[PDB]
């Protein structure tokens, strides 16, 4: 049986011995002349090392050379939201320009966007250095905890980034995460990954690559993009509605074993009619995932309840009935 | 219509113009020769002033004269947990001696005990100076937020305290709050106080006085105490099972308009068979609480969904069916 | 594990193999000089001989003396329904008098009152001569099917009957069965009795003796009677609220093993605050009833679902999800 | 507001002043030389006139020539069930050949097949002469009551029938109605027609024409037919899988206003992936149907609860938790 966390406190200690105190190279593209950026890459990874859950995100000081490229990705891509982007993202980004502080000059710290996501849907961002485990990033996302990075792509590559940075996720991930039914859907991707096998971790990350990271929506009839990495780079948002890639309909099995690269612009895409339809289709795929149990996210204590017994489903079922009797008493109150 | 909070971010700004920047006197008993304790009372009042939600509780430095009285209330009342105290409190206090850091010499800081309650039930302790509003302390309690006071009673009164301190709540309130059934019960007391009138606030606070603050339980046949203030003082825990006060059965309306004082050891007590019997009896009382709506705690975003329409109950009921479809897909998985 | 029916057609064969084609004597009191009444009992018994489920009840002919003692029990007991009887039974009796055909001169046949119960709550009266198995009558009452006797007590004993007749059941059982929550209550006793062992069958029939057959209610503060046999005989309805019997509170375990006779007017009675509270106490008793499975009454096909696996509870919960999506769409429709 | 029934007893009273005591002609094709068949059509039309609910179906005598065309349709169409027909029908027709009494020589009476539908899903066949109101046949279907015709098409036209006969519905309708999901699905079509406007009756009947009467399924990958009239006539069952008609995908609104004829083999068909997917897609279409309320089928009393208030939704919701606490105590029983 593969391992999965139980509390958000247990999310740290068993996912830092595998993901942290690791001396990482600069980028997988080997060798940069960016040593003062590498020390900026080294200090930015050391914030997530001593960070434990419940402690706040320590704020990041920024020099102007990554602020100006944060400005360069801002003024390009915010103008690129009227082009080909999801309309749910447009109202979410308008909320992020008022609440979080999405601007050209000031890059928002990870705390104030985390305080935004707890007030909208209850997600929180979690600072982490690497994407080094595909399981642990998915196992955290079940806890309504999005693993996020605190670094920026380099000024030499301001448009295409081979690794997810704050320009990737604060503009691509978390404006989708401010949606309610997407955040329940993106969690149920991670809710299927607890104790899931390594090919199921791969299949869910194959699924996660094509309906959250790089996924195309359909709002008001017209097809728009809602993927995180689609709304993170310059030409790919122009590429997804362009027709030299092909857009399949979103299927569970076709997104389970889909081949994918990470460097050039992706060929296969998955059109999703709505975030709820992605949630209904993840309900079909998470059922057939073979597992000796299943898990329910217990959102009061923000934990995971293993349903490895009929008795465990019962103490979840009264957790439904204590708030369904709330609905039974609310329908008496209103009227 | 009275005012009630909507988010935990809105819990601070509309409950500090009414409860904070108030220059408080030392104690309601007028006149102490405790000026170096009054500046200690003043600095412990100002830590909650600029405290905003989402920020952690800053740690408190302690001089030895309140350490020794924290040591005095510890070695007496932990010895008084075999006598007349709840067994559900007893295993909880055993968890509080291991996880939170309860001992003789060091008083546990508020961050470590609040991070404990995130792991158990999802309550959090929130630092506040005064008990200045009886509505807002109940209005925060629906948000799974317990208003708590970071000061200590004076060394001249080590046993009886006229005001709730850390010796009141960190030994009386929180080890009840770590129970799952009592936390849902104590929140439903606060869930009736949202938008409720001032005599309904007073009816609920008289109810809160007799089934959370001073409430007596019944485990293993014998009657024990589970009240917060009962498990907070020297002689009162020996007084509640004594027969010179009378213990009534816990009733919805006979706890609503029950008279109460605060100085003398209390006469009337309310025996509760279990916390679930306290929960279903609050379900009967909060139903008849007259209100233009009812409110439901949204445990994902830690907020309140006001159900003032049939449409508002639906967007809760979609959250119930997405919760139940997790359960139906779990019962397919287990078996 | 003993035997219990699954379909309503399987209420017939395995409960007529043990309770039918039995040569029955006239009364358990030894010896009547009433051979024409014996032929009446024999013909009434062979009405239920070839009766299968889905067939209507064949109408019963009545001569002058059973019509006259029906008039006697009707004009005594309807006049006594103002005396110490349930007001819910009073309004249900008014509904029976305008709907089913309750009058002094004509005794109502079983078909019209059965069509009334399928109109109100969905019970059906089902003709059978003897109560020969205490297990099978309860296991029928699981199916919302009340086994019922199509004969009349003796004319020389118009007030006290040693056996349940139409003057017993049509006066005491069926106007309680037309109530919603008491029907769901009395169905849950048989739902507890499905596949239960012999001393569990004895305990559940013993409970049924004290909360359906002879059970006492409390409406508007005042104690009244709602039991079947209490509201079936003349002197017992005035005896039960007299003080020479003792009335304990309704308890799940103290009604399970409570001793009882049947000839003398009963000593111990069980006051119930409401039929809903009786339903909660039967829920708490039926929880602790030891059984390798449970059963859910599926009221669409009127059948019984064994929950002996999490898969069975899943395909039970899917119908709950259809009927709750019905409510979630209804709350969108209304507003 | 249009009129809708409330009980199954009230289903007869206000759907016989509008559909019964009307002298109907032989066929809509004007003029047959079939006077002794017209009296056979008349006596079948008069068996439904004095029919009431709860009163069972009286048996129908059959002479040779309606048996001889029942001989003809049973040899041809049962051979046409391995070809192009739904496999869920095939196991149901095998269930219908065993239980109901389906054979070549004896046309089964309506009582033995209606006793089967109460045994599987809880539907019942209700004898009626004409389909004269498209609302009332839909308004009955919400009650799990299928309006059905106890006559047979003439021997001169034994393969194509201009009107639904016993060969239409006992081979087409009821072996679909024995499915658990389809009976819930076909009721939800009728559940949208309560108090619905005449264009909504027409929109539902055009919907009912294309997903129950003439609807094509997709079982095990291959496309098969599950429509009632498709599995009722000779050449149409080979026509629907043929390619000179076109089979659209089943849609909510494209089935609502879809034009249709009745004489020529139908052009447009609606492929449905499963009966549950048709139930999900009727959940989407009947949601957007404008109505002053919605209706819930209360399957205990076999009646309809009109949900024109939040209070009416609440007395449904206590029915949910009453059988959810059944499920909550079942998950404790099993384990
Ligand atoms: Fe990302
Ligand atoms: Fe307190
Ligand atoms: Fe009886
Ligand atoms: Fe038809």
Residue numbers in the entry:
A (entry chain D), B (entry chain A), C (entry chain B), D (entry chain C): 163 to 497
From the paper:
Tyrosine hydroxylase (TH) catalyzes the rate-limiting step in the biosynthesis of dopamine (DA) and other catecholamines, and its dysfunction leads to DA deficiency and parkinsonisms. Mammalian AAAHs mainly present as homotetramers with a three-domain subunit structure: an N-terminal regulatory domain (RD) that consists of a structured ACT (aspartate kinase-chorismate mutase-TyrA) domain preceded by a less structured N-terminal tail of varying length; a central catalytic domain (CD) that contains the active site iron and binding-sites for substrate and cofactor; and a C-terminal oligomerization domain (OD) responsible for dimerization and/or tetramerization. Inhibition by catecholamines and reactivation by S40 phosphorylation are key regulatory mechanisms of TH activity and conformational stability. We used Cryo-EM to determine the structures of full-length human TH without and with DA, and the structure of S40 phosphorylated TH, complemented with biophysical and biochemical characterizations and molecular dynamics simulations.
The central structure was also subjected to a further refinement by masking out the RDs, and the final resolution reached 3.4 Å. In the 3D reconstruction, many structural features could be assigned to α-helices and loops in the central structure formed by CD and OD domains, in particular the α-helices involved in tetramerization. The four subunits of this central structure have an asymmetric arrangement that could be explained by the tetramer being formed by a dimer of dimers. The comparative analysis showed differences in the region encompassing residues 176–196: whereas the Cryo-EM model revealed a helical and loop structure arrangement, the crystallographic structure shows only a loop that is shifted from the former. This difference could be ascribed to contacts established by this flexible loop in the crystallographic arrangement. However, while the resolution in most of the TH core ranges from 2 to 4 Å, it was only about 5 Å in PAH. There were also differences in the CD that have to do with its arrangement relative to the central OD, with a 12.7° outward tilt of the CD in TH compared with that of PAH (left). In the active, apo and non-phospho state, the 39−58 α-helix of TH is detached from the main structure (I, apo-TH).
